Amino acid sequence: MELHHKNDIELKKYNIGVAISLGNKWFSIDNIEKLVKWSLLHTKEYVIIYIADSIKLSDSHAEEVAIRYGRNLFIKIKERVSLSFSQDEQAKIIYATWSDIADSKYKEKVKYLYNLYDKNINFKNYIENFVKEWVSKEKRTFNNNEINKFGRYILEELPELMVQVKARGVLFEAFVYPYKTRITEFVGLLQKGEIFPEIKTNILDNHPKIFLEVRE
């Protein structure tokens, strides 16, 4: 389990976030645990564990995920960690729920995306196509009202992937993830302003989240 400048991680200049995709088959407890091992070694100081995407007891879909499943996932993770790591390692690990991340400043960026999603048909159309591709991987089908529902849900997590955000007071500049996805490619074009440049102009600050590709 090693990372795919190069010298910045081996200079341990960044705090590392472990972005978990709930329900993704790769994110077993063992792989999560190995991602936490790697991050504790290479981090500046803290390791942040959080729920990244999710591909009605709340008006927020990420908040809904957090309370239906993210809680019990975090509990299993804490159990495993308390057996696999020493006391001094565990004090470096922060469990960040959706609420910890989606403070007032964060929600402003989401609402900007929501606004763009309704007023700008090309953004809506492009976001909608994202969902339609993910559906086609499945043996399930979805209607256009569902496809459009799930596109809004991406916008809710889109700022955390692009911008450096605090959680429980802690800015984490980098996050580990085992593979490139259509999402990480899109975020890279956004950050560079190569696609939908009004997004960069509005909700980015040239403090881009560093994506570290770490897998076995």
Numbering used by the authors: 1 to 4, 10 to 60, 70 to 230
Excerpt from the paper describing this PDB structure:
Cyclodipeptide synthases (CDPSs) use aminoacylated tRNA (aa-tRNA) substrates to form peptide bonds between two amino acids yielding a cyclic dipeptide product (CDP). ParaCDPS from Parabacteroides sp. 20_3 (GenBank: EFK64745.1) produces cyclo(His-Phe)8 whilst ParcuCDPS from Parcubacteria bacterium RAAC4_OD1_1 (GenBank: ETB63777.1) can synthesise both cyclo(His-Glu) and cyclo(His-Pro)9. ParcuCDPS belongs to the XYP sub-group of the CDPS family, characterised by the presence of 3 residues: X40 where X is a non-conserved residue, Y202, and P203 (numbering respective to AlbC). ParcuCDPS displays a Rossman-fold common throughout the CDPS family.
